Structures are given as C-alpha cells and as structure tokens.
Amino acid sequence: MSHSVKIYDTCIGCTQCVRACPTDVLEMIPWGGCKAKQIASAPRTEDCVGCKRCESACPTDFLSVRVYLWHETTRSMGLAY
Amino acid sequence: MFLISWRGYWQELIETLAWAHERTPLANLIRWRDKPVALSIVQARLVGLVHFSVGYIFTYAAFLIASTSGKFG
Amino acid sequence: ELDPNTPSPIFAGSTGGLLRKAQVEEFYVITWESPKEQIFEMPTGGAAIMREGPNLLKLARKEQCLALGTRLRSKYKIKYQFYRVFPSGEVQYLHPKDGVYPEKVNPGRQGVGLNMRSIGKNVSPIEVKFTGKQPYDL
Amino acid sequence: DLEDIANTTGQWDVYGSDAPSPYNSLQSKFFETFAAPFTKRGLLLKFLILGGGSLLTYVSANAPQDVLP
Amino acid sequence: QAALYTHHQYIAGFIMTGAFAHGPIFFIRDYNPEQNADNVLARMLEHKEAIISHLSWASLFLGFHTLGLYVHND
Amino acid sequence: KPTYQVIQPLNGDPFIGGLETPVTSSPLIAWYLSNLPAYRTAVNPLLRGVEVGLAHGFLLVGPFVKAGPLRNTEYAGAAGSLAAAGLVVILSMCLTMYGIASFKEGEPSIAPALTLTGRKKQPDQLQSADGWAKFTGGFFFGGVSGVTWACFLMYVLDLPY
Amino acid sequence: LVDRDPIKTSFEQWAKPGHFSRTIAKGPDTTTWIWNLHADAHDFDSHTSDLEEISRKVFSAHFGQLSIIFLWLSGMYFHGARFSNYEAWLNDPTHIGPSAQVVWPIVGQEILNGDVGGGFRGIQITSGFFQIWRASGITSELQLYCTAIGALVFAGLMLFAGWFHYHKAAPKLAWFQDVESMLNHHLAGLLGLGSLSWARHQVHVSLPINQFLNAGVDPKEIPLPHEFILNRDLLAQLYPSFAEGATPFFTLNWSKYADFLTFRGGLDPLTGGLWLTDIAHHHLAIAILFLIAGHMYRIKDILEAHKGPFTGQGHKGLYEILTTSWHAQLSINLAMLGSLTIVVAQHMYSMPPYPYLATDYATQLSLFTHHMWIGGFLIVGAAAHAAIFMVRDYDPTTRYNDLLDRVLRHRDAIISHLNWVCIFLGFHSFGLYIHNDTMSALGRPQDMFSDTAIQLQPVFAQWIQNTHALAPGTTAPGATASTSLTWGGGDLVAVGNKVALLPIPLGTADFLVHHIHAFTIHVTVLILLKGVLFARSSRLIPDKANLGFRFPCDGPGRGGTCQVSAWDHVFLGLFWMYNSISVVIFHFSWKMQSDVWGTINDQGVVTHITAGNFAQSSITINGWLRDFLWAQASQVIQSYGSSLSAYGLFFLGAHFVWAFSLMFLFSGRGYWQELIESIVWAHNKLKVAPATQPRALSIVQGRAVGVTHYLLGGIATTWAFFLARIIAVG
Amino acid sequence: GDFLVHHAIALGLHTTTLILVKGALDARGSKLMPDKKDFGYSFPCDGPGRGGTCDISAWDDFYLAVFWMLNTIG
Numbered sequence A: 001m002s003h004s005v006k007i008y009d010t011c012i013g014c015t016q017c018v019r020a021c022p023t024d025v026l027e028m029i030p031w032g033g034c035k036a037k038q039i040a041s042a043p044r045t046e047d048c049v050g051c052k053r054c055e056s057a058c059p060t061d062f063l064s065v066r067v068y069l070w071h072e073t074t075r076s077m078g079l080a081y
Numbered sequence B: 001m002f003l004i005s006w007r008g009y010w011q012e013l014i015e016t017l018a019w020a021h022e023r024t025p026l027a028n029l030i031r032w033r034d035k036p037v038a039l040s041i042v043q044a045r046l047v048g049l050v051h052f053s054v055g056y057i058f059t060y061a062a063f064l065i066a067s068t069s070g071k072f073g
Numbered sequence C: 001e002l003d004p005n006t007p008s009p010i011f012a013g014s015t016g017g018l019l020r021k022a023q024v025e026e027f028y029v030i031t032w033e034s035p036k037e038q039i040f041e042m043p044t045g046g047a048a049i050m051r052e053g054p055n056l057l058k059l060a061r062k063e064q065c066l067a068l069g070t071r072l073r074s075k076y077k078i079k080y081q082f083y084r085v086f087p088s089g090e091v092q093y094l095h096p097k098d099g100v101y102p103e104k105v106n107p108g109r110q111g112v113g114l115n116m117r118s119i120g121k122n123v124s125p126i127e128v129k130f131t132g133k134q135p136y137d138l
Numbered sequence D: 001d002l003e004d005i006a007n008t009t010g011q012w013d014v015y016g017s018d019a020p021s022p023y024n025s026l027q028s029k030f031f032e033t034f035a036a037p038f039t040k041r042g043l044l045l046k047f048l049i050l051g052g053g054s055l056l057t058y059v060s061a062n063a064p065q066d067v068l069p
Numbered sequence E: 001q002a003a004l005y006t007h008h009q010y011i012a013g014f015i016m017t018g019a020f021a022h023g024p025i026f027f028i029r030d031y032n033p034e035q036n037a038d039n040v041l042a043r044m045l046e047h048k049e050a051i052i053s054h055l056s057w058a059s060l061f062l063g064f065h066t067l068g069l070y071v072h073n074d
Numbered sequence F: 001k002p003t004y005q006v007i008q009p010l011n012g013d014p015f016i017g018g019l020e021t022p023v024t025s026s027p028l029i030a031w032y033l034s035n036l037p038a039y040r041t042a043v044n045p046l047l048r049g050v051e052v053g054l055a056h057g058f059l060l061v062g063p064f065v066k067a068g069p070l071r072n073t074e075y076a077g078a079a080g081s082l083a084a085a086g087l088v089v090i091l092s093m094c095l096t097m098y099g100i101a102s103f104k105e106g107e108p109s110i111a112p113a114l115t116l117t118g119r120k121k122q123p124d125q126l127q128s129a130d131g132w133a134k135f136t137g138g139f140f141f142g143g144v145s146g147v148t149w150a151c152f153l154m155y156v157l158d159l160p161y
Numbered sequence G: 001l002v003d004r005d006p007i008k009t010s011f012e013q014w015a016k017p018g019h020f021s022r023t024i025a026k027g028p029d030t031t032t033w034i035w036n037l038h039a040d041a042h043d044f045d046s047h048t049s050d051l052e053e054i055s056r057k058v059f060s061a062h063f064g065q066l067s068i069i070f071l072w073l074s075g076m077y078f079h080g081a082r083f084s085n086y087e088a089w090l091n092d093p094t095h096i097g098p099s100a101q102v103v104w105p106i107v108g109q110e111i112l113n114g115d116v117g118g119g120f121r122g123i124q125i126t127s128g129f130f131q132i133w134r135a136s137g138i139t140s141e142l143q144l145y146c147t148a149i150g151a152l153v154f155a156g157l158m159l160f161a162g163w164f165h166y167h168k169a170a171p172k173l174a175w176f177q178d179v180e181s182m183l184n185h186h187l188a189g190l191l192g193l194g195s196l197s198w199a200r201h202q203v204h205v206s207l208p209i210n211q212f213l214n215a216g217v218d219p220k221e222i223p224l225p226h227e228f229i230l231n232r233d234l235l236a237q238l239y240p241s242f243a244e245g246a247t248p249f250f251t252l253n254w255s256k257y258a259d260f261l262t263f264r265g266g267l268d269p270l271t272g273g274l275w276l277t278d279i280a281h282h283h284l285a286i287a288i289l290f291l292i293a294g295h296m297y298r299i300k301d302i303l304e305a306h307k308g309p310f311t312g313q314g315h316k317g318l319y320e321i322l323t324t325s326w327h328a329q330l331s332i333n334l335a336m337l338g339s340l341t342i343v344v345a346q347h348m349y350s351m352p353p354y355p356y357l358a359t360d361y362a363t364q365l366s367l368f369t370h371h372m373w374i375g376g377f378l379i380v381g382a383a384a385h386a387a388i389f390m391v392r393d394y395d396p397t398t399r400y401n402d403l404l405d406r407v408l409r410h411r412d413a414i415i416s417h418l419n420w421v422c423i424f425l426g427f428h429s430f431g432l433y434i435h436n437d438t439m440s441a442l443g444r445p446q447d448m449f450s451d452t453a454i455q456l457q458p459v460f461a462q463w464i465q466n467t468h469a470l471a472p473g474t475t476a477p478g479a480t481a482s483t484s485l486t487w488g489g490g491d492l493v494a495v496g497n498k499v500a501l502l503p504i505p506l507g508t509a510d511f512l513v514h515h516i517h518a519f520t521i522h523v524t525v526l527i528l529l530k531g532v533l534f535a536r537s538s539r540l541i542p543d544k545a546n547l548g549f550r551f552p553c554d555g556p557g558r559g560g561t562c563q564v565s566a567w568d569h570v571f572l573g574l575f576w577m578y579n580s581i582s583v584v585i586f587h588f589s590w591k592m593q594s595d596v597w598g599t600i601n602d603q604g605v606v607t608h609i610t611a612g613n614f615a616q617s618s619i620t621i622n623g624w625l626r627d628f629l630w631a632q633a634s635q636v637i638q639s640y641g642s643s644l645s646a647y648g649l650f651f652l653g654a655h656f657v658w659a660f661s662l663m664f665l666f667s668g669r670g671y672w673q674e675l676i677e678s679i680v681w682a683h684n685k686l687k688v689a690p691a692t693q694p695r696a697l698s699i700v701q702g703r704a705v706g707v708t709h710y711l712l713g714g715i716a717t718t719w720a721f722f723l724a725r726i727i728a729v730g
Numbered sequence H: 001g002d003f004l005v006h007h008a009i010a011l012g013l014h015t016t017t018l019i020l021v022k023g024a025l026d027a028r029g030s031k032l033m034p035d036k037k038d039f040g041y042s043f044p045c046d047g048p049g050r051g052g053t054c055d056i057s058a059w060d061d062f063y064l065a066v067f068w069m070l071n072t073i074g
C-alpha cells in the first residue's frame, strides 16, 4: 500500500522456502534474533507488479497477499503500453 | 463473457491488439490518453450481472405484457 | 540503427519487444557474461545466440528481463545484470546498488513488516475515520 | 570479369531518403484565409456546435406536410 | 395488475440483498470487537459456524425433497 | 542488390518489431505515401487538410445515396449531399476535440524551407495545437464541399453488373 | 518408490499411501488427490522423465479401444439380430420404422416400447445399422449372431495384444523411433487391403443379393449361406464370367458390354441409396491407390528441401522431434481425423451411400449431427494437444530457428490479423440479421435484406452448383443426373414412399447463415490459435512456462492475470465450438425440411414437412424460434405418455444439467471452502468429519465441471429436441 | 400444485440467505482467509495456492447472492 499484502510469517528463513517473484523482494535483513535470522516482509516495493507467487511457497501463516494495492501504476501492470 | 472470461485472456490479446496502431500507417502518432486494458477482476463479475439482470428482467418485462394483453387469459 | 552499430545479443526480426512506450517513458535493459557460442530461449517468443561484447540486450519492461535467470540460470553463470535506462540518464540504479543476489546481508534498506500492530487479532477493523493528525500515513 | 559488372550504375545508391519527388501542387494560398473561420480558429467550435448542429436538425426535423414516418 | 406486483417483487428482492450487503460492510469498515463483546451482536459472530449449517441443512433438505417431487411427478 | 535490402529486421536493431517485410517498406509502396503526412510533414497540416477533407469527401455518397435508408432516391436532394454533409460535420469536431490531446502553444510558420529538414525527433508529437487546427479546418472545407462535386456531378453511371 | 525397487519383489504394490510427485500424497490426508488420480491419470511429466515406456503404454492402452469398439458393435449386431425387427423390416421397408432395443416392463417402463414395424413393441433407432446391414449377401437373424461373436472374437484376442504388450516386457525406441516405414504398410494394404478386400464381398455376394431384392421376395427365397462360390453362374445376371478377355488389358471386344461398374451417379427408383453397380468400382479405384501409394519410401529428404526467401528455412528440419513428440503427432491428426469426419457429414446427406436413407430422414441426420460433433470435438482437442506440445514434450530446446521459431517471431501478428477479421465478420455476420428485426419490427420491407427486397431477383443459380449438375458434358463421360442430385440442373422423380434429395436452392437465407459460420468458425480458432501460440511465454507473463499448460491463473496482479494459460484457451474454445456445431446443426434440418424432405403424391405435387417457411423468415433470427425452436419442439413438449417420451423426459433434465453448469462455471473457490467448513464444523460436533481433509474444487477442476456439463447439458437437450421431430411426421 | 412452488419459494430465501448470512457472517475472515480485512468488502480475488482462493470477498457472495434473489423473485 501502495503495495500492501502481508506474507510475513515468523521464520523468514529463505532456504527451501521462497524466492520467486519478479524483482520485488530484496530481503535477508537479519532482525536481532529469529532462528535462521532473516526477517520482515519486503524491501523497497515500488518496482514490480502483483503476484501472490509471493507466498504460494514459504509461509505467511495467516493470509498471503494477492492484488491489494489499488493505487496502481502501470509499470505496475505490464500495460502501460 | 463477463462470467466465463476472467480478465487474463482479454488483456493479453489486447497486448497483441495494441501492437497494431503503433505498427500501422494512417493510424500512428495518434495517441490514446488512456492505456488500453481489460476489465478489473471484480468489475466483470459485476458487468456480467448488471447485464445478466436487465436481459433477464427486461425479458419477463416484455414476456408477461406481451401476453397478458392478448390473452386469452 | 547502423552508422553506430554496437550490438551483442543476436536475434534477427520479431514483433515481440520494445515499442512506442519505451521512448516517451522509461526503458529497462539486461546485460550478462557467457562462455562459448550458445543458443538461447528468449522473452517475446523467438530465439537466437551469444559469444559476447557487452552482451547487452534491451528490454521493454523489467519483469521481462530477469526471466533471463528463471531459465538463464539453468544454463550456467554468475553474472547477469539489468539496469534502468531513461530518455535522459538516472536515479533508479536498478541492479547496480549494493551487493547482489536477493538472499545475503550488507544493509536493510526498506521493507519493515508490521504496519502499526502485527498480524495479531486484527478482528479490530479499520480504526479512526482518516483524519489529518494520527499516524496512519504508512 | 564481365559479370563483375561494377554494379551497372551504383545509383548513388540510396537515391536518398533523398529526393524522389518535388512536392505539393502550387494550389495553396488559393485558400489562404479562403475559408477562414477554422482559419480564425482563435477561440471557436463552440459556435459551430450550436450553429451547424441546429441546422442539421432544426429544419432537418420539422417538415411542412409529413411524407411521414 | 400483473406488471406491478413484480416491479415490487423485483426491487424488494433487489433490496433484501442490499440490506444483507450493508450489514456485511458494518462488520468491516465500521464494527469494533473490543467495544461490542460478550455483547449480543458478538456471540452472533462467535457462535457462527452453526448459523450457516442449520441454514444449509434447510436448503439441502428443501433441495432434493422438492426435486424428488417434480421429476417423479414428471 | 542483395537477398532483400542488406537483409534487415527494422531500419536496424531487431528488438523493436515492425519486422520490415514488404507491405511495410518496399520502395514500391513507401513512396506511394509521402507528399502526405507519412514520412515527413511537407508544408504544415494546413493544406493537406482539404486533399484529405475532399478525397474522403466525395466518398460517402452512393454509400448513403445508393445504400440510403429508403434507397435509390427520387429526391433532387440525394445522389449527393442530402444529409451526409453530416458525417464530415459529426467528425469535423470528432477531430477538434482530439486536438485537445494536443495543446503545446506556438507560431513559427516553417512551411517555407530552410536546411534539409528531418524535423529530427519528428516522431512522437512535435505538432502543436496550432497546426491540428489548420488541418481539421482544412477538413471541414474538404468534407463539406467534397460532398458536392459528388452531388453536383450529374451521374452517368454504369454498371453493371 | 522406494519400495523395493530392485530386484527383490514380484510382490506387487497393493498398500502404502500414494504416488504422483514427491512430497506426494503425503501421509497427511486430503481429497483433492482423488480428482487428481483420475484427471491427468494419463499425462507424462511423471511415470518417468524418459520417453521409452510412454509410447510402450500408448500402443497398449490404445488397443483396449479397438477391443471395446469390439465389445461394443457386438451388442448392436446382437441386438440388431435376436431383438429382431431387421428380418421384419427388410421384406418390408418404406413401411417399418426400425427397432433393436426394448425395455423389460419394470416399474413405469413400457411406455418407451411402442409399435415399430414387423409387429412388435420397442424403442426406435437413428443409428443406421439395418442399413449397412442391407449388405448381407445372405440375410438371417442368428447369422448376425455370428458376425456378432466374430466381434467378441476380435476382442479377448485384440485385447490380449495389450497384455501382449506393456505388461509383457515391451518393445523399445527404435521400434517406433524408427518411423521409417509406418504409413508404408498402413495406406498400402488395409487402407488398400480393405476397400480392396471390401470390393471382394461388395459384388461377389452383396450387389447380386440386392440386385434381385430391389423387387420383392422374402429372403431364403433368395441368398443361401454358400451359393456364392465357383458357381459363377448367378454372377451371370450382373455380367460375364469374362467370356473371352483374360486379366483386363486390350485385345478385348465389346459389341455389347463393359463389366459391372458401368458408372451411375444418381439414385435407384425403388431404393434411392445411390447405385451399387458403382460402389464396387469406387472402392476398387481407391485401394489401387494405397496399393500404389503405401510404397514409399524408406524421411527428411522431402521436407529437407523446398525453402525460399520469406518461406520456411526450418521447413527443412521440420522436426527431428516428429519421431519424438506424440502430443505433437496427436494434435496433428485430430485436426485431420476430426476435420476429416465432418466432411462426411455432407457427402452423406447430399449423396447417400446406403440403401434406404433420406426417405429414412431421421436415420441419417442424427448421423449428420453425431458425425458433426466429432469433426469439432476432435478439433479443439487438435489444438489443446498442440498447446501440450508448445509448452512441453521435448527435453531441452534442440529444435531451433525454424518454421516455428519463425511463426512465433510474428505472433502478436498472425493473431493481430484474424482478430479484426472477426469484428468485420460479426458486424457483417450477425447484426446483419438484427437489422431485419429492428427494421421489420420497425417494418418497412422495402429495405430489409429479404431474399427479395435488397437486390437479388428470383434467381441464385449462376455460380458453381449450376456448373456441377450439368458437368456430365465435359471431359466428363456422364451417367444420368450428376454426382449429387441436390445440384441445380435436371431431374426430379426421386422415391415412392416420401422424398429424398432435389436441387436445394440458395441466395440470401443461405447466403448469410453461410457467413455466420465464417465468423463462428473464425473467432473459434482465434482463441485456440492465440492460445496455443502464446503457450509458454508473453508480455503479460514471461516466467510463464514454469508449471504446465494448465495452471489456474498466474495471480491477481498485472490487472487480471487469470484466464491466460491454454487449458483455458481450450476451455473457452470448447465454449464457442459448442455453438460452431450447435448452430450448423440448427442450419441443416431447418433447410432440409423447410425444403427437400416433404413429399410426393399425384402430379408429384411436392409437400415439404414445411412449405418453404425459410423463405423470408430465418432472415429474422426470431423466425429462428418463430419458425424453429417454438415451431418444432412442440413435438418435444407434446411427447409425454407415448413411446419416445424418453426424449421429452430427458429434455427437462439435461435442459437442467446445463442450467447447473453455470454454478460450476460462474463461481469463486475459497467460497465453497468458506462454506465447506461451516459444514465441517457441524460435522465435528457429532464427531463425524475430519479424516480425509474435505476440500473444495481445484480452481481448474471447477472449470472442468463447468464446460463438460454445459455441453452434456446444452447438447442432449437437442439430441432430444431432434429425435421427436423426425420420428412422427418428418 | 401450490404445495410445491410454495416449498420452492421457501428453498430460495434460505439458500439466498445462507449465502448472504454467510457472505456477511465473515467479511471479517476465516481459516482460508483469516485476516480478510481493513477493506473487507470488494477485494475480489486472491492469489492461487493456499487451497486456491477466489470470489471470497463478502461482495462476491453478495455478487453470488444476487443470482438466487434473481431465482426466487422468479
């Protein structure tokens, strides 16, 4: 929000867990203690489109994201062209 | 359509169908001011409906009348 | 173009990539290394070859030009590299910045993950009515 | 080498983007302002959409003795 | 008399829905679990899984039992 | 000389589409189209206006004088103008309020010639509103008018058929 | 898997949860995998990453079709035998109205069983045995009762060839992965040696045993069970024992003959099923070719050859992988097999090949729409399976820069055109009709599009029809009539019960249906074409070959990102074709009865099932339920309490089942979840649910249970609508 | 004749409302979508995976509702 879908979980470990999703997610930002110690929910999200490929894999244990962003550029949908 | 169509298929051939103009003479430069797209993923659940409905409600409309009027009853 | 002909990523024709909206706005382009002359797969449907130069193909939009990876790393190579071209220069230094390979640690940059309160009992709906004085612009 | 014909006239070649017709018939400024009022276009169109379109429809619908629907 | 019972049957049905549809918006934009609880609008939420079931049990019954009687009859 | 030009996808780089085949860029065609607003903007849009207005003008006659709503007319105001001196008018401001997607507000006058043009970045726009006027103004006097040496021309006709 | 692989157990795998991708069906319980298992049961991305077997399965689990087609047919020959009516009907055709099936009078049943001919209670037929069966250079009920077990013979055996594959330790690669000969064989001697062999048992025996049937008798007052050997003495009536000729060639004299054949064209007065005196010659004249033809050849060579400038460099090399595909060499086939079935559906009705058809109306249109839905249900397929290619089949990308890599090169292109094609059609191809309504309901005919208002004038004629029935005066030899009696020029006299075929006139109301077909055939194909083409990659998703050719929809983003894929292009392309065929049918019978079918009496004053109501009145698309749907169908909704009744009595269900599809077609998915739990809750209180985690339908399963229903609904609806307006007047 | 339609107008507002009751009785969320909120109503769609998730906004049940209000009221 403008890209606000929560995939968070609690492990935020990313080995045999989740990577998939065009650019958007440059994480591994180890918070001071969370097991395989890499955490949070995103990096700078003003770049790419609206997947839920975002979970599909590696837990969000609650929801999982999808489209919810509304304010929606174009670069933010393939088609501005 | 709206109802068994689902934005994906529509948008994509509009991706090919907006390679026309841009690539065809006597219809170049000629700019849209709104970027050709396919209907939102809630919007068309509505529109098929708000469409399903008039048809439907405009059919009994004309059905009953068109036969309670003649009759015989 | 030709009088300047500086190419790298072989192709021939195609009604696929780049068209009007990559001048009038933004540009997007990927670059890479490679060993010896190899035939690839391509975004936009087609398919060609490699060898070198910069190995610098230009690409319509950046979801398009990382898929060299989603297969173009099932075909050897550390190094592949896409930036952002404008119609004039910079800010948005795309695969530039710091480190690379989304899954390491130098800094933390953005992200956060929480909103105000965390995933916990937001059976609590939408709170205040949106009013210019209580920290809900984030 | 006979069929090496030194490209029987090179051409130059590439004609051009250069220059394969002069231009547009001299008929022009034989309309100079002739028909202006879209050549006085300096604020108009609102005028021609009451006017023109009240006389493609005023008399255009009315008629003195039907020849009906 | 017969294109006038119905523009009042359409609508009327057409309402009801919208009725039922702004009382599933209260629960999201407005509503306030900490401010309503033990409280009988809650409990209505809380003891909800039954509510749709002892509803769905009506339909499924009201389903095949109307439809035995009408094919059988055909 | 070659297999077909120095063999090329586009002017040059093959990462733009166009797939320059014939029907695209054969000197056979690309010259049948550039006294007009194909590659280069001759004089201003001013004059092109009426060869455009007019040519497209005396069309739309037998379309709506031989396929007219109750057709083959015995009314001296048809086999020509009749109404259709409506289309040109319903569309001679179908245009003007598209030249409101052009503003860019100037007055240079460069329909006279200087140094072998290019108009350079001539692509994209680079035709302001005070251009698109003198064209869609050429349009009206090309549409309405181009409708009458249709009409005015008696009609000797064949076919057919 | 893992289990015992080895070498170390005959002991078969009955017991231990799962199999089919690898954090498989997991220990942990669920339901989805029970539609999994049946769906995709046949598939190949699992079983093994290695060709080999698969062709070793498909050549077996193939087999069990033939065997089946073979258990089937038996119960049809048996059926078309001792549940008789065939004996009865044949001495007595023009008269009967055939049966094979009959109930048993349990519960309500019997109404379904209603006097059909040679004196018995039963349910009719629109499946023209009793008419292949004319054949029987023999006749006899117990006889078909041999042809019948002759059937079960081929089966058990042509079904133990399927034991005698996969399960037996199998052939391999070379065997098919040398293709070199295959069609060499197939077309030469079977294609040939059948048509050939069929010749020999198509004048020998059949011709004579209906040469003197087309008159009277009661069988066995004709055609013994052996009689037709060496005895070349009854072959005496139907030409020479060659008299003085020896193995054709020329030093032959005809002062008065020219062997059987003596080419016909037209229609027996007394049995207008087209002449048989021909039917030998044409099958003979086939086989030869096949006989000569199946004698190529060995492959590339011929395709590794003709290229050009813009043409197909890759033409040359058009697939090593056409010995390494299937999914490819199936999809090609379906387009042909399929497209080569509904070409039947014409040459049939405008050229009957069996004795008593046309007169038999309903027993060859059933046909012309059954055959019609395969020459379509097999074509969308013929696309699906190409999509299945286009996505996956090969190992890597070894296939390169060719005819395809070409076509794709353009792709936002071949489908860029085709599109506008359709909206040009549609506007010229349907709103065309809508004019009429809007202006005939406005009402000013002066200006409709009538076969008479918009300029066309009491003739259609001058085109090519009129240079077909009239061509027996070219290089043409001749033979009274034409080729297909339905052509412009000459002749009338066809049949002495009811009618058969005659000219079939055109212009408009033939002009424009013929065009709706265009636009219908076209936009069908758009969606399959662009569907299979954009199979794997795109500028809505390029990371888009990453699972399979199905996948639900990529994800809420990009705007829509739902339908895409190509399971689904082969989901909305069925959706059309159901029309494509469903309106072509609608066409034929409304013609074929509005004109043609109808009837002679004195001065043969013709009396169609309908005095051409078509005329001015299909042109209105209401006329299409004024004159059709509301006109005919009055036999469906009158049909209660009768004998056929099972149609009207279907026509409500299946005219229900369709109106159940929409629920499967039109709805979400975490919906029936969100619902399936409320349920699951009430379940747990009594202690009655959890085990086998009950789950809603697999996004695309859901679409699977659309579509399939929408068709078996929307279709048998007319299958009923029909048989109910040809049985009984017509 | 009336002891059926009269049970089939009864199978309408019941079914129509198991869906509206339901539609409503969690625009809030549930197991498949737990935290279904801050926007509740028309968020139509969600990503594939979890079980496969769709017309599971309280709007799209409203959306879905309006077919039976168009089948009772008929």
Ligand code: CLA
Residues within 6 Å of the ligand: B046, B050, B054, E014, E015, E016, E017, E018, E019, E021, E025, H041, H042, H059
């Ligand atoms: C009698 C009144 C009543 C009132 C006072 C409101 C008031 C409101 N409704 Mg609402 N609603 C009602 C009845 C009412 N509703 C009923 C009966 C239904 C269904 C039975 C709904 C279903 C509904 C939905 C889904 C939503 C609202 C929403 C809203 C809010 C925004 C309105 C909006 O989105 O319109 C803007 C609409 C337009 C400007 C026009 C587009 C509407 C389309 C669908 C046309 C509909 C059919 C049309 C007549 C056919 C075309 C005509 C043809 C002859 C050409 C507002 C609070 C929104 C909301 O805020 O919820 C979160 C939204 O979600 N309503």
Ligand code: CLA
Residues within 6 Å of the ligand: E056, E059, E060, E061, E062, E063, E064, E065, E067, G656, G659, G660, G661, G662, G663, G666, G667, G675, H011, H015, H019, H064, H065, H067
């Ligand atoms: C005519 C229609 C068709 C049928 C048969 C149904 C039936 C049903 N719908 Mg439904 N629906 C439809 C079209 C249909 N819908 C359409 C077009 C839409 C909108 C696009 C919807 C939107 C909708 C919603 C929102 C809901 C339903 C629900 C239901 C169920 C409600 C319970 C009930 O009525 O009794 C039960 C069912 C029947 C009387 C139908 C017959 C089912 C049995 C008798 C099958 C026959 C068995 C047969 C002998 C074996 C054949 C199978 C095979 C072995 C050959 C019911 C299964 C609701 C529900 O889930 O209830 C819990 C609710 O979710 N529908």
Ligand code: CLA
Residues within 6 Å of the ligand: G038, G039, G040, G041, G042, G043, G044, G330, G334, G377, G378, G379, G380, G381, G382, G384, G388, G567, G570, G708, G712
């Ligand atoms: C030569 C042809 C033929 C063959 C051998 C195949 C073979 C195959 N197809 Mg295929 N296909 C064909 C023609 C053929 N197809 C045609 C004509 C079409 C167009 C419709 C398709 C459309 C198609 C699709 C979309 C898919 C396949 C897939 C497949 C593969 C999956 C097989 C499977 O599990 O069975 C599937 C059959 C069932 C699970 C049985 C269910 C049948 C139901 C729907 C009943 C039909 C209605 C009927 C009236 C019901 C019986 C009566 C009842 C009322 C009592 C397999 C390799 C699938 C794949 O993923 O590739 C690997 C993919 O799903 N095919």
Ligand SMILES: CC(=CC=C/C(C)=C/C=C/C=C(C)/C=C/C=C(C)/C=C/C1=C(C)CCCC1(C)C)/C=C/C1=C(C)CCCC1(C)C
Residues within 6 Å of the ligand: G069, G189, G190, G191, G193, G194, G195, G197, G198
């Ligand atoms: C073994 C044999 C044979 C044969 C023959 C044959 C081998 C024949 C066959 C034929 C085939 C056919 C004739 C086919 C048929 C088919 C059909 C009939 C089908 C039909 C159909 C269709 C149309 C499609 C689908 C469906 C159906 C199936 C119905 C023989 C051999 C031999 C030898 C060595 C020795 C000496 C003698 C001889 C003789 C020389």
Ligand SMILES: CC(=CC=C/C(C)=C/C=C/C=C(C)\C=C\C=C(C)\C=C\C1=C(C)CCCC1(C)C)/C=C/C1=C(C)CCCC1(C)C
Residues within 6 Å of the ligand: E064, E067, E068, E071, G652, G653, G654, G656, G657, G712, G715, G716, G717, G719, G720
């Ligand atoms: C209600 C019902 C039924 C209904 C039904 C209906 C209401 C409908 C149905 C339908 C079905 C179907 C329909 C199937 C089928 C089929 C067929 C056999 C087909 C065939 C065909 C072909 C071949 C192809 C196409 C065409 C046609 C379709 C013809 C039932 C109910 C019930 C109950 C009470 C409880 C218990 C169970 C039961 C007893 C069950």
Ligand code: SF4
Residues within 6 Å of the ligand: A007, A008, A009, A010, A011, A012, A013, A014, A017, A018, A038, A039, A040, A057, A058, A059, A060
């Ligand atoms: S839950 Fe997802 S991405 Fe989140 S922390 Fe784990 S894998 Fe990282």
Ligand code: SF4
Residues within 6 Å of the ligand: A020, A021, A022, A024, A025, A048, A049, A050, A051, A052, A053, A054, A055, A065, G557
């Ligand atoms: S889930 Fe969202 S952020 Fe993540 S990749 Fe997809 S679109 Fe990007």
Ligand code: SF4
Residues within 6 Å of the ligand: B041, G552, G553, G554, G555, G556, G561, G562, G699, H045, H046, H047, H048, H053, H054
């Ligand atoms: S599945 Fe549902 S959600 Fe997913 S994409 Fe399709 S529609 Fe959207």
